[PDB]
Amino acid sequence: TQVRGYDFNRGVNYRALLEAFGTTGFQATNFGRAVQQVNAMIEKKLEPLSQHADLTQSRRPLTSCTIFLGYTSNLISSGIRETIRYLVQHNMVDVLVTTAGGVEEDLIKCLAPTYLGEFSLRGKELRENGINRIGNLLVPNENYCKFEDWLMPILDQMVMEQNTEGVKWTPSKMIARLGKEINNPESVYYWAQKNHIPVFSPALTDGSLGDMIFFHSYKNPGLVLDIVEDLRLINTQAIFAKCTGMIILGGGVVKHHIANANLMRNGADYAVYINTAQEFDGSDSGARPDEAVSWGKIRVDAQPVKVYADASLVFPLLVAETFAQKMDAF
Amino acid sequence: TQVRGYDFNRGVNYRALLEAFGTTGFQATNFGRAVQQVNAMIEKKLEPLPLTSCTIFLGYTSNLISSGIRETIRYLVQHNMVDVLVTTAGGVEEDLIKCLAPTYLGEFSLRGKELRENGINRIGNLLVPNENYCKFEDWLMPILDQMVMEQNTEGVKWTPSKMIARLGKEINNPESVYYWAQKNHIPVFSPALTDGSLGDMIFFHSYKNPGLVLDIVEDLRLINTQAIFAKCTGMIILGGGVVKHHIANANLMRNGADYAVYINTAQEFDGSDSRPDEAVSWGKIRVDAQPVKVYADASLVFPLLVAETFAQKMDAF
Amino acid sequence: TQVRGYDFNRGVNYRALLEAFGTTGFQATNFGRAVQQVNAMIEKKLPLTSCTIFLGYTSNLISSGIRETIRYLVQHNMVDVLVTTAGGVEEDLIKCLAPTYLEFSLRGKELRENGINRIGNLLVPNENYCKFEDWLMPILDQMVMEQNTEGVKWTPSKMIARLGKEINNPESVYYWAQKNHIPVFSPALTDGSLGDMIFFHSYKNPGLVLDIVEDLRLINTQAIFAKCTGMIILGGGVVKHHIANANLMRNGADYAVYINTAQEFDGSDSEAVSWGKIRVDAQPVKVYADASLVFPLLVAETFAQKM
Amino acid sequence: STQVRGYDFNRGVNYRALLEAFGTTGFQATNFGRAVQQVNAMIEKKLEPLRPLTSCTIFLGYTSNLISSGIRETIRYLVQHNMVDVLVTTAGGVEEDLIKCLAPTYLNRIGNLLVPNENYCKFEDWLMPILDQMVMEQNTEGVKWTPSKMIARLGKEINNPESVYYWAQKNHIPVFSPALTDGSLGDMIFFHSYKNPGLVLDIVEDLRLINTQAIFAKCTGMIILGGGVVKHHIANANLMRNGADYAVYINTAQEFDGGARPDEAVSWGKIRVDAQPVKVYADASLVFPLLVAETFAQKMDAF
Amino acid sequence: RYTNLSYIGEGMVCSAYDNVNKVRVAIKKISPFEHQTYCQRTLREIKILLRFRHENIIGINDIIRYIVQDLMETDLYKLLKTQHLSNDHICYFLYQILRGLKYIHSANVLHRDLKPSNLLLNTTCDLKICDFGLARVATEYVATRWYRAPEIMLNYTKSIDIWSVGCILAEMLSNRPIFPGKHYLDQLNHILGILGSPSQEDLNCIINLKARNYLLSLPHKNKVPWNRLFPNADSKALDLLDKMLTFNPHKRIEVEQALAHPYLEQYYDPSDEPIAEAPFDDLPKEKLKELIFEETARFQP
């Protein structure tokens, strides 16, 4: 194969410009391999299949392929949220893994907005004005004043439900309960409960949601949460699957939890990574795709690809050709 | 302060070379601010008033405890030199295994298919044989059977901290750091113990002797109160991830910590949770503080950072 | 201004998608600042010109598919000054004679016995340079003859122009360089294989002379006499410092765009106000991403919809 | 087949053992140990017996940052006692060192260091007297000028024992720099070009000098600190002779864009197929003094 | 009597020398009183070893109320770790391991966990069997699952020992072991992948409901020829290995046919191999100790 690029003498044509990236090189050929991989992934889902619920304790019809998705907290409050909502509203994914910061940020966005800002600003001055900093974004301190006024009754009712009727609470269930209360067609966790897509987040205590739990404890004590039940659900969601795929959009615990789930079934069959980490430190976040096959988390027949770029400038473009051109096919 | 390196014509005296790094410049001089910052913590801890005059927070990721830095961590804990610890999921399974079978060295360019066929796993530029994990099963299973008996009959609730304390007592080996954790009353907290080989192994146990319960609502009440009732605090964070955010949120209740030192190698253009200015914004650290950050690998700076401000005032304890 | 993305439920229309990137934050808002800056450059620009625009690139870009975009930019007299690296001038000519084919994990030892050279994830055959040698040998002979007889002092710029004038191939970016009177400057040319070719030609017919002060005088005098200046830099190295020093002698530049991928922790060249390179009343922009994935999209919104 | 072990502080504080203990520490310490071993092997090969020739000719290069920082003192130690053979530098590596001999610097910005604007005024009043004479020699003596000779000339006028380039001439150690018009030196040259025009500098001879220095050596070694033009220049200079023997890189770049791994150089034939290059991904300031203080410094009376 | 006290390993085994017997043996300390489960192992071990008798099977000569048995230089683990094997040595080792298997199986006793760490060797180039504690008459935790039978792994006939010896033979032929795993599902996956997909005719004996469903809910994979896995072996070796490693428990190679296989037919003489002279719980504590004392009563003045 030769190496060519867009001529640009034919006029601006967007269909060809994003299709000519596959023969440019460097990070462009990685993008082409990624789009080819994801396009190959969806084609298997549409094939018809022609009991299982009791074994997996889940209310959902098994499809030809189950797609796993995960994201890091800083991505949710970065404007990517519209793409995730589009991916979830119509069934296109089956498992979501996040961090407590993600749910904390996503819930408030339905109640109050977030404003832009600049990268270099001293925090000493910003603290007096009452402005917090998250990257290049700035959030007000007034925003956190309505969450405290809205979450306490839910926890009161949860404690009452635990004491009165038999129920044991798991992180996969507290998320679902919050969704029905928000009652809004623009929050991604509202559509999660409607179409029965479970959400997992083992590190739920750490975050601003933890702060609310601590204060409540010294007035109505007794709340209980268990993390051993979620493991069973996530593992049996992958053991009994015909074929699987992974789309990990950031490094951290989300990468470890998703990959380790597929270990019990001799790896996945298609995968793609998008993160900006490094490998010389040896951190799991920066591990190359070929490192996964050593542990037995990515089958030896697949061809994983990994793109080094910020998720903001790549993810919206990737969903433009793969998942949007076949909307009528669902 | 002018710029001036070390002139070797005088000779080779290692003591002067380490101190001279302060005025060298660039990232070398950032290391110079670390030795001054950490020294203040130790100086303030010994002041006359169990509860001490300063509480030291220490955390690490899964890599370091699997590498050779484990020896340094043991020294910092055996002699009652830090108070609480924070770790990740693998930080305990990798630690306990090393007391039954060792790890080996290698390279970075090794492929994956050949290693998978042979049966050797790879992490970083180190290799761990597959037979090591099987030795875990022989030792962890008998202790988990006793775990479920106490809950049903004696009625004791179980949280990750108590589980780590219980596990530390059983191994009975001075090399393992978690042995000294239980022998000196130093709690160890880790919010996500589900991940890692430990979770993979507690899974299969559920299908024979079911009914184990772990709670994450009592750990928050221990970490928060360990800091709300203290005079002065400090931070020493290695790496990044959940371990950093947990510590930062814990220190928030007292209007931020006082002394802090960060050692990691992440980048800031992606806005990931992994600069000290952000901590001042939300309230993680105090305004009057002077945090420092060093951009270097943790396996080349930490043994030097402990070579000063530690292991020198040993008799002072 | 709040934060908002692109709602795909309305359909796909690429005009909106490439504009909505401004509202979303992180490394996408900087793209919007960049597009606004280059649009301002275009508007101000519309022989001496109302605005002179500098352009520079690192040799690894040229061996890739971005080479065609640079050709389009130079085609219609949209840029005025080009500054490159020794490798950049060496690879464009090869492509007009032999092509280059397309992993990061290939070992060099195995490729060594098969005669394959590796640059990034691309491969260039070893037999390609034989044609380069055979074609380049005769021209330097007349070059030295002209030096000894006619008496014309020579600098890298004029030799690059003379080399471009003879290839006569529209795909060559240096063909249209000589036709439109657009100079090309390079500080160090002997670094690349051209230096090796000069060495092999040193023993027979010796006496080739190259100068380095005349090129500096030319670039400085081009920069100093100008109403409005702008900088576009793709990569880092000697080229960026050279451009900054070129524009320093007029108290600064007005607009600038950087697209590189290095970090500032090492302290290397890869802050301009501290040397007056950039003017105080300017708002320089800067984007962290690979050039291969961002530059083609930049030419989509600007430099293409206006002519 | 070696285990992983660290220093046990219970013994005490023994620095010499601590520096060696990095070899089995792992991650980015094993590379440090490999670098130490390789440099020691190179110096041992230099020691054995057969400008006078030497059994092995070593190379050294750097970026403009390190000279402005504290590494200036330690790189002066190497050239003091004829430890190296050929040096290469960028444009800023010559101007910065000359300044330090006249006026100091305090911690107009290079990064984590600040230079006064008035500092550059003193260099002005000193550069024309030497440059004014240089053009006169060409007109009435027929001497050709190259960057190497011009750098060598500059050292003879300082006459101060704290400047690196002053000690370059006392042992006939050439200093090469392909792009010298960049930086403040070219800016000062520009002004002279109007008052007394005529200066001409050739670059074809510099390539000849470096390449003939490369080809006629029995054994070669590469130690380059930092990436950029210097890396490719040394690599292409050593492209002949069918590859170099020993090489150590120290830089912090990444390979996602073409700053590359040492293994890629082998494909071009720049490094021999039987060699084992060593890479280190830490900052230069925090690593180089330790490397010099462990390998070179132990042997002083031997030279 | 006892002298030349030294160290071997760790109960605990130490070197010793009997002055009266003028012979060199090893002594191992056993303390099973703490747990009934440990005592169950102890009761079977004293009973099983004492009643058996044969040259290849290890024997007990005295008990010090502390067990007196002969000592070998090293086991198969160290030899396989260091030195590679050859055709004749592999042949001899296989003929003897099988000869022992015939007597134990003829003795109508079921063995388990017949891993190479329980096979011993000495200077005279001979092999022996040592450990027999977990055994039964034809949720128990085993040290290693690497060399276990799959109908045990997935919830007892005589095929399990044949499976074990086949695994040892393969591990002797190829330097690395054949079926390495970490999780129970991991080992199941490796075994199924290497040996090919289970056919429905094969899937009749398995009775566990969930396991049957799991094995049914699988894709189809093609069996790998043994020549591809071993490019430097004998055709007879490959044939014997393929016949030994069979998924069907009711249809697999029996011990008598294996000894007379053409590979080993050279050292096999029907008259030579012997047959057994004689054809072959709850939780007490106090009377269990009484039974232990009664069994061990003979070995003291």
> In this structure, what CATH number is given to the domain that contains residue E201?
1.10.510.10
Distance from CA of E69 to the nearest CA of B (A): 27
With an 8 Å Cβ cutoff, are C27 and B270 in contact? Answer: yes
Report the 10 Å Cβ neighbour count for D209: 16
Cβ contacts of A270 within 8 Å, gap of 6 or more: A37, A38, A40, A41, A245, A246, A302, A304
A207 falls within a domain: yes
What is the SS3 assignment for B238? strand
E185 and E142: one domain? yes
Nearest to B299 among D2, D25, D289 (CB): D25
D1 falls within a domain: no
Q: Rounded to whole angstroms, how far apart are CA atoms B130 and C303? A: 58
Local structure of residue D22 (DSSP, 8 states): G
What is the SS3 assignment for B254? helix
With an 8 Å Cβ cutoff, are E181 and B118 in contact? Answer: no
Nearest to D27 among B5, B17, B299 (CB): B299
The encoded tokens of residue D159 equal 């006459």
E261 and E294: one domain? no
The string of DSSP letters for A22-81 reads: GGT-THHHHHHHHHHHHHHHHHHHTS----HHHHHT--S---S-EEEEE--HHHIIIIIH
Q: Which chains touch C (3 or more CB pairs under 8 A)?
A: A, B, D
Cβ atoms of E30 and E67 within 8 Å: the answer is yes
The string of DSSP letters for D193-220 reads: HHHS------SHHHHHHHHHHHHT-SEE
E233 and E127: one domain? yes
Q: D285-298: b or e for each residue (b if 16 or more CB lie within 10 Å)?
A: bbbbbbbbbbbbee
CATH number of the domain where residue E37 is located: 3.30.200.20
Chain A residues 35-64 with CB within 8 Å of chain E: 55
Query: Which residue range forms the structural domain that includes residue C68?
Result: 48-98+127-301
Q: Rounded to whole angstroms, how far apart are CA atoms D222 and C73? A: 41
Q: Measured between beta carbons, which residues in chain B are less than 8 angstroms from residue C27?
A: 269-270
SS (H, E, C) E132-145: CCCCEECCCCCCCC
Number of domains making up chain E? 2
Would the annotation count A276 as a binding residue? yes
List, in sequence order, every beta strand (DSSP E) within chain C. 52-57, 81-83, 116-119, 122-125, 184-185, 229-234, 255-260, 285-288
Q: Residue E81 burial (CB < 10 Å; 0-12/13-18/19+)? A: exposed
The residue of A279, A280, A283, A288 whose CB has the most chain D CBs within 10 angstroms, and thus the best one to mutate to test that interface, is A280
A16 falls within a domain: no
Cβ contacts of C27 within 8 Å, gap of 6 or more: A310, A312, A313, B269, B270, C287, C288, C289
Q: Rounded to whole angstroms, how far apart are CA atoms C87 and E48? A: 81
Alpha helices in chain E (DSSP H): 36-51, 76-82, 87-106, 150-153, 159-173, 184-195, 209-216, 226-229, 235-244, 255-259, 286-296
Give binding residues of C for spermidine as ranges: 90-91, 196, 241, 267-269, 271-277
Query: Which residue range forms the structural domain that includes residue E38?
Result: 1-71+282-301
Amino acid at B72: T
Nearest CA in chain C to A74: C26
Local structure of residue B9 (DSSP, 8 states): G
Distance from CA of D187 to the nearest CA of B (A): 26
Distance from CA of D201 to the nearest CA of B (A): 34
Number of domains making up chain B? 1
Nearest to D257 among A26, A281, A282 (CB): A26
Nearest CA in chain A to C75: A9
Q: Rounded to whole angstroms, how far apart are CA atoms A223 and E137? A: 53
Q: Rounded to whole angstroms, how far apart are CA atoms B238 and E192? A: 43
Q: Rounded to whole angstroms, how far apart are CA atoms D298 and D43? A: 11
Cβ atoms of E278 and E43 within 8 Å: the answer is no
Q: Which helix (H) or strand (E) holds E62?
A: strand E62-63
Q: B184-211: b or e for each residue (b if 16 or more CB lie within 10 Å)?
A: eebbbbbbbbbbbbbbbbbbebeeeeee
Nearest CA in chain A to C26: A136
Nearest CA in chain A to E183: A264
Report the 10 Å Cβ neighbour count for C139: 11
With an 8 Å Cβ cutoff, are C24 and A83 in contact? Answer: no
Q: Measured between beta carbons, which residues in chain A are less than 8 angstroms from residue B265?
A: 278, 281
Would the annotation count B240 as a binding residue? yes
Nearest to E176 among B118, B133, B138 (CB): B118
Using the structure block, give the residue that is written with the tokens 């623009």.
Answer: A186
Would the annotation count E28 as a binding residue? yes
User: Can C277 be counted among the known catalytic residues?
Assistant: yes
Q: Measured between beta carbons, which residues in chain A are less than 8 angstroms from residue C65?
A: 3-6, 20, 23-25, 28
Would the annotation count B175 as a binding residue? no
The residue of D233, D264, D272, D279 whose CB has the most chain C CBs within 10 angstroms, and thus the best one to mutate to test that interface, is D264
The string of DSSP letters for A197-260 reads: --EE-S--SSSHHHHHHHHHHTTS------SHHHHHHHHHHHHT-S-EEEEE-S-SHHHHHHHH
Count of helix runs (H) and strand runs (E) in chain B: 14, 9
With an 8 Å Cβ cutoff, are C104 and D181 in contact? Answer: no
Q: Rounded to whole angstroms, how far apart are CA atoms E236 and E264? A: 10
Cβ atoms of D278 and D38 within 8 Å: the answer is yes
Would the annotation count D163 as a binding residue? no
Catalytic residue, chosen from B45, B183, B284, B293, is B284
Q: What does the angle CA C62 – CA C66 – CA C67 come to, to the nearest 5 degrees?
A: 50
B197 falls within a domain: yes
Q: What does the angle CA A41 – CA A47 – CA A49 come to, to the nearest 5 degrees?
A: 120
* Euclidean distance between the first and the last CA atom of chain B, given in angstroms as a whole number: 34
Give binding residues of C for NAD(+) as ranges: 59-63, 85-87, 91, 191, 236, 261-262, 290-291
Would the annotation count D65 as a binding residue? yes
Cβ contacts of A255 within 8 Å, gap of 6 or more: A70, A248, A284, A285
Local structure of residue E222 (DSSP, 8 states): P
Q: Rounded to whole angstroms, how far apart are CA atoms B50 and B230? A: 11
B157 falls within a domain: yes
Would the annotation count D270 as a binding residue? yes
Interchain touch E–D (≥3 Cβ pairs closer than 8 Å): no
The residue of B110, B113, B132, B194 whose CB has the most chain A CBs within 10 angstroms, and thus the best one to mutate to test that interface, is B194
Using the structure block, give the residue that is written with the tokens 């108290």.
Answer: C251
Distance from CA of C180 to the nearest CA of D (A): 27
Q: Rounded to whole angstroms, how far apart are CA atoms A35 and C43? A: 36
E18 and E150: one domain? no
Q: Rounded to whole angstroms, how far apart are CA atoms C26 and A74? A: 10
Q: Measured between beta carbons, which residues in chain D are less than 8 angstroms from residue B3?
A: 68-70, 104-107, 113
E235 and E286: one domain? no
Nearest to D28 among A27, A280, A308 (CB): A280
Would the annotation count D199 as a binding residue? no
Q: Which chains touch D (3 or more CB pairs under 8 A)?
A: A, B, C
Distance from CA of B237 to the nearest CA of A (A): 15
Using the structure block, give the residue that is written with the tokens 């009592």.
Answer: B218
Q: Rounded to whole angstroms, how far apart are CA atoms A139 and A18? A: 35
Cβ atoms of D87 and D61 within 8 Å: the answer is yes
Catalytic residue, chosen from A45, A146, A255, A297, is A297
Q: What is the resolution in angstroms?
A: 3.5
Q: E190-218: b or e for each residue (b if 16 or more CB lie within 10 Å)?
A: bbbeebeebeeebeeebeeeeeeebbeee
Strand-pair category, E67-69 with B259-264: unpaired
* Radius of gyration over every alpha carbon of chain A, rounded to an integer in angstroms: 22
Supply the residues of E annotated as catalytic.
113
Cβ contacts of C112 within 8 Å, gap of 6 or more: D266, D267, D269, D273
Q: Which helix (H) or strand (E) holds C167?
A: helix C156-167
Q: Crossing angle for the helix pair C128-149 and C156-167, nearest 10 degrees?
A: 120
With an 8 Å Cβ cutoff, are B27 and C265 in contact? Answer: yes
Cβ atoms of A266 and E193 within 8 Å: the answer is yes
Cβ atoms of C88 and C62 within 8 Å: the answer is yes
Distance from CA of D262 to the nearest CA of A (A): 14
Q: Rounded to whole angstroms, how far apart are CA atoms B85 and B62? A: 13
Distance from CA of A199 to the nearest CA of B (A): 16
Q: Rounded to whole angstroms, how far apart are CA atoms C243 and C54? A: 8
Would the annotation count B279 as a binding residue? yes
Q: Rounded to whole angstroms, how far apart are CA atoms D203 and D179? A: 9
Supply the residues of D annotated as catalytic.
270
Q: Rounded to whole angstroms, how far apart are CA atoms B312 and B316? A: 9
D14 falls within a domain: no
Interchain touch C–E (≥3 Cβ pairs closer than 8 Å): no
The encoded tokens of residue C252 equal 């600064």
Nearest to B199 among A72, A231, A251 (CB): A231
Q: What does the angle CA E225 – CA E229 – CA E232 come to, to the nearest 5 degrees?
A: 115
CATH number of the domain where residue B94 is located: 3.40.910.10
Cβ contacts of A326 within 8 Å, gap of 6 or more: A42
- Give the residue from C34, C53, C31, C58 showing the smallest Cα distance to C236: C58
E109 and E87: one domain? yes
Distance from CA of C217 to the nearest CA of D (A): 7
E137 and E50: one domain? no
Using the structure block, give the residue that is written with the tokens 């130093």.
Answer: B186
The string of DSSP letters for A106-153 reads: HHHHTTS--B---S---HHHHHHHTEEEETTEEEESSTHHHHHHHHHH
Q: In what order do the strands lie in the sheet with E23-28?
A: E2-3, E13-18, E23-28, E67-69, E62-63
- Give the residue from A61, A113, A58 showing the smallest Cα distance to A229: A58
Q: Rounded to whole angstroms, how far apart are CA atoms A141 and E231? A: 70
Q: Which neighbouring-strand residues pair with C81?
A: C54
Q: Does B315 touch chain E (CB under 8 A)?
A: no
A6 falls within a domain: no
C115 falls within a domain: no
Would the annotation count D91 as a binding residue? yes
Nearest to E182 among B118, B130, B141 (CB): B130
Q: Measured between beta carbons, which residues in chain D are less than 8 angstroms from residue B2?
A: 104-107
* Euclidean distance between the first and the last CA atom of chain A, given in angstroms as a whole number: 36
